[PDB]
Structures are given as C-alpha cells and as structure tokens.
Amino acid sequence: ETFYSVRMRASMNGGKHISGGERLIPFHEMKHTVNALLEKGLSHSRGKPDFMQIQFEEVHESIKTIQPLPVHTNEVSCPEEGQKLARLLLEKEGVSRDVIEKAYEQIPEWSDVRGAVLFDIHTGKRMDQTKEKGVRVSRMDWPDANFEKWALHSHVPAHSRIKEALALASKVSRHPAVVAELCWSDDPDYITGYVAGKKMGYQRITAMKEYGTEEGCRVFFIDGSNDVNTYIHDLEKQPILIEWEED
Amino acid sequence: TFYSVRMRASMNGSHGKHISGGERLIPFHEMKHTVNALLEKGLSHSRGKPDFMQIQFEEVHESIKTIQPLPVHTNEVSCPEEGQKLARLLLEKEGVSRDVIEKAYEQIPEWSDVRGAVLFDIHTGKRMDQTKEKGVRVSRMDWPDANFEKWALHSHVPAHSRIKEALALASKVSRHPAVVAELCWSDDPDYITGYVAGKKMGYQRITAMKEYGTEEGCRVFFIDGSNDVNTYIHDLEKQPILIEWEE
Numbered sequence A: 001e002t003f004y005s006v007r008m009r010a011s012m013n014g015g016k017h018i019s020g021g022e023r024l025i026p027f028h029e030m031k032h033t034v035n036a037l038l039e040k041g042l043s044h045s046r047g048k049p050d051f052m053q054i055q056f057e058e059v060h061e062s063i064k065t066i067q068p069l070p071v072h073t074n075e076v077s078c079p080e081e082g083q084k085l086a087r088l089l090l091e092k093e094g095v096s097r098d099v100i101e102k103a104y105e106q107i108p109e110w111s112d113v114r115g116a117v118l119f120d121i122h123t124g125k126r127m128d129q130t131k132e133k134g135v136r137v138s139r140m141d142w143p144d145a146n147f148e149k150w151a152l153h154s155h156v157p158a159h160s161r162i163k164e165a166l167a168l169a170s171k172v173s174r175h176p177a178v179v180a181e182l183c184w185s186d187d188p189d190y191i192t193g194y195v196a197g198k199k200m201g202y203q204r205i206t207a208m209k210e211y212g213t214e215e216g217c218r219v220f221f222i223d224g225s226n227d228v229n230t231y232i233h234d235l236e237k238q239p240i241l242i243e244w245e246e247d
Numbered sequence B: 001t002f003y004s005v006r007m008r009a010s011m012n013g014s015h016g017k018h019i020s021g022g023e024r025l026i027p028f029h030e031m032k033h034t035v036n037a038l039l040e041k042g043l044s045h046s047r048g049k050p051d052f053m054q055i056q057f058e059e060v061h062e063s064i065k066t067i068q069p070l071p072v073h074t075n076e077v078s079c080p081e082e083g084q085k086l087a088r089l090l091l092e093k094e095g096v097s098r099d100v101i102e103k104a105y106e107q108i109p110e111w112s113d114v115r116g117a118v119l120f121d122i123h124t125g126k127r128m129d130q131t132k133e134k135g136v137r138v139s140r141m142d143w144p145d146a147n148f149e150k151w152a153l154h155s156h157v158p159a160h161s162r163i164k165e166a167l168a169l170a171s172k173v174s175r176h177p178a179v180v181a182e183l184c185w186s187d188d189p190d191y192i193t194g195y196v197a198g199k200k201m202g203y204q205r206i207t208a209m210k211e212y213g214t215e216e217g218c219r220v221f222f223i224d225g226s227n228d229v230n231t232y233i234h235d236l237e238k239q240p241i242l243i244e245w246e247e
C-alpha cells in the first residue's frame, strides 16, 4: 500500500509548453492515471504536442494529509476588476503594495515559465534561479471521490482543474515561508484565477484575463531567512494528499 | 508523420535494477494503444515489479527506411555450454577473430548490468562505447504486427513479440555497415534462447544460452569501422527502421 508520484510534461515544437500534470496515487490506479495524464496532454487547448514524457516513481517519504483551504468565490464583471481585487487580497494577506507592484511589472516576462516563480517580499525580487523552468510543485493529489463530495458541499463545479489548483494551493500555503500565491491559467479558454494565503484561504476571482489570451501566471510570495533551495526541495518533494472532512 | 515511443522501468529507484525497456515507432493515431502496451509490458515483467518507469514519445523527422528481416535459422542444442560454444563458432564464421571473441567473453559477466548494448571494437579488442552501465540503446525500429504474424507463420516460428522485437533490433543493427556481429541472450530468467546475428549467416537462434532462473543476459555488437564511436551511437539511436517482410 505504497504511494506513487506520477508526472507528465508535453510540448509543441525551445519547445512551447503545452501541458503538465502531477499525481500521487496508490499503485492500483496506475493505468487510469497514466491514461488520464496522457489524455490531458493530447487534447489540450494550447495545441497538440510532438513531445511528451510520463513518469512514475515510488514515494518513500511518508505522506501528510491535510484539509483544503477554505474557499470563497469573488464574482467580478471584468479582468481589470479581478486584478484590482487580487492586488487588494494580496495586501490584506501581508504583501506590501510596493512588492506587489514590482511583481506585476515582471509578470509579463514570466509568462513562459513552466512552473512557478518565487518572489522575495524582503528584496522585492525574484528569488529562484530556475529561469524558464520555474519551480514545479509536485507529489500532491486529491482522491476524486472526496473531491466530488467537497465540490457538492461547497457549491463549486467538480472540475478537475479546480481539484488540481486547490490541491496545489493548499500544499503551497501550508509552507511556513509562503505568504501568498497569485495564479491564473495559461489556457485561452479559462479566465478564472485565484489568490491564496493562510488567512483568507483560496480566493477565486472569476475573471483574471480576457478569453483567448495564453499568458498565465503563478507566483509564490516568500518570506524566509532560509535559502531558496530548501524551499524548492520542499515544494517539489514533500508528499501531500488532500482530504476534506465531512464533519 | 511517425513517432518514437520509448519506455524504461527499474526496481529500487531509477537507473537500481533494470526491469524492462521497450521501443516502438508508430503513426500518431496508435499512441494510446502503444503507450498502454508499453505500460503493461513494464508492469508484468518476470524480473520484478518496478518502482520507477518512464514512457516518452517524440516526432521523428528523419525519413523512415523499410527493410526485410534477416534470414532466420534455428540451432537446437542440448545445453548452455553447447550453445555458447556454437555461438563462438558462429561469431568466428562471421568474421570476428578468436582472440577478440575470447576477450569479450571475459568481460561479459561484468556487463550483465548494462541496460543497453555494449560495443566491442575488433581493432582494439576492447569496449568502444563510454556509456558504462547505461549502454547504447537502439531505438526507432518496429515491425507492424500483421506483417510479423505472416512472417512467423511462413517461417514456422512462434509469433511471440519477444522474437518480433529481437529480430527487428537485430535486422536494424546488422544493416549498419560498421557492425560485423551481434551476440545476444535474454536477461529474463524464464527465457533461455539467444542468438548470434550478422550479414553472412543472418539471425542464428540458439535454443539454450543459459540456465533457467539466471538473470544475467547479454547484448554485444562487434564493430569494425573507420569512424568514431559517437557517430555509430547516434546511428543506432536515431535511424528509423520499419521491418516489412516479403516472400
């Protein structure tokens, strides 16, 4: 009854990143999961790939189980309104306005980062040295049956895109060096994003960009005296399962 | 357009004891079936269940050469020591000097861990490649099943995919002008038939090359060429070949 990390990446054609996925599962779900990842890479709205890697490996570290972040959905009528709300939420979560503004000026240049960017709240600058690779959070997952119940109860659609985002966001927010996350999709067909943090949980914002744009974003705002490589190793390696508790 | 699809699997981490490997060359619309076949093949291998696996695909741009399989002849022997003796004889008849053969047989035991093939230079009486435990992995060859089944029927050989794969590989490799001979037997404890292959005598199966239950296998290509080893490695890894038999 050991668990397995299963990862996928796909690209078209410096190939254009198409898709990526990370799962953490018991062995008997291997076929379904390899197939799900396969399908997800093949039928992606960003294009059809000519390169793909799928990989699995046994996880030896013990698995921590946590609840998902509390969720609140902020209806907005347009992107400029959502982005404005997001900047306000980041501030209320503890990021200084100047650090936010500095980050927003560089977000456009980070659109091609395949993973996430780490931004130091002390130095007002990018902290990681992974460049276009970014920091890829992995070994987190949310068993589907539990997620469906959570969706039902939370009156949210049971879209796997939400399951994956919230699993990621809950793992990342747990890290003591992470004050906040800002995310929206690089998929032209999906405009909802979020801001997430310990105090205000997972704050969905229903419009963060215009349809048809392919620029997405993932930034983790970091407050830590420790070195960045420690934080990177935690985000990449530490296994997390989400389990929401009905009571 | 065609796609190279590759798999490797190991136990006790990645390349750890090598469990399985596979290489396919297919049109895009056979991707799901082929990813699944490779998955299945790694999961149910007689050498153990893996705790690591990689499956990968990529578009092939080089144009595809189609060739006939090597002529086949089956040598019945009563024991391993006899098959090995016959194999040494066949290698000599194919053009390898006795001294080079003996030198190779002294090293074969330490090469059991090589995940791919070993290249042995007839000019130096020594190993030619610098890949150590990785070895040289031949790929981008395949034999459409329908055609293979006919060939098996007509040749009075069992239509086992293990033979399809070995003969596809041996035919690609023997075509390379710098390859005088190949010596192979399986690293699978349940399969004791091996072969020697070359241009003059084709694909010579030897029905006993080791004792049942041993996991030491072998794959050595004897090289006589005027070029550097990296060229030959690139040819073996990169030249796309489909087998198509005709009477």
Ligand SMILES: Nc1ncnc2c1ncn2[C@@H]1O[C@H](COP(=O)(O)OC(=O)CCCCCC(=O)O)[C@@H](O)[C@H]1O
Pocket (backbone or CB within 6 Å): A020, A022, A113, A114, A115, A116, A134, A135, A136, A137, A138, A161, A162, A165, A168, A183, A184, A185, A186, A187, A190, A192, A193, A194, A204, A216, A217, A218
């Ligand atoms: N595992 C990861 N680790 C770090 N960054 C990642 C990871 N996966 C994706 N990213 C980065 O995040 C960017 C966005 O990727 P995507 O998968 O397109 O992101 C989304 O779908 C976000 C959806 C949030 C709203 C869901 C909801 O309705 O509640 C992508 O470009 C990468 O830069």
Ligand SMILES: Nc1ncnc2c1ncn2[C@@H]1O[C@H](COP(=O)(O)OC(=O)CCCCCC(=O)O)[C@@H](O)[C@H]1O
Pocket (backbone or CB within 6 Å): B021, B023, B114, B115, B116, B117, B135, B136, B137, B138, B139, B162, B163, B166, B169, B184, B185, B186, B187, B188, B191, B193, B194, B195, B205, B217, B218, B219
């Ligand atoms: N694609 C490759 N490229 C280079 N070396 C390879 C490759 N595939 C396998 N090898 C090497 O060969 C070794 C064993 O390969 P296996 O897949 O175990 O090979 C076999 O089943 C051999 C079949 C013998 C003849 C079949 C028959 O006519 O009845 C393996 O451990 C590697 O070291």
Ligand SMILES: [Mg+2]
Pocket (backbone or CB within 6 Å): B021, B022, B165, B166
């Ligand atoms: Mg094989």
Ligand SMILES: [Mg+2]
Pocket (backbone or CB within 6 Å): B019, B020, B186, B187, B188
């Ligand atoms: Mg084998």
Ligand SMILES: [Pt+2]
Pocket (backbone or CB within 6 Å): A012, A013, A016, A047
């Ligand atoms: Pt493209």
Ligand SMILES: [Pt+2]
Pocket (backbone or CB within 6 Å): A012, A013, A047, A048
């Ligand atoms: Pt394309």
Ligand SMILES: [Pt+2]
Pocket (backbone or CB within 6 Å): A092, A093, A199, A200
């Ligand atoms: Pt607040």
Ligand SMILES: [Pt+2]
Pocket (backbone or CB within 6 Å): B011, B012, B017, B048
């Ligand atoms: Pt083992």
Ligand SMILES: [Pt+2]
Pocket (backbone or CB within 6 Å): B011, B048, B049
């Ligand atoms: Pt094992």
Ligand SMILES: [Pt+2]
Pocket (backbone or CB within 6 Å): B093, B094, B200, B201
């Ligand atoms: Pt001969």
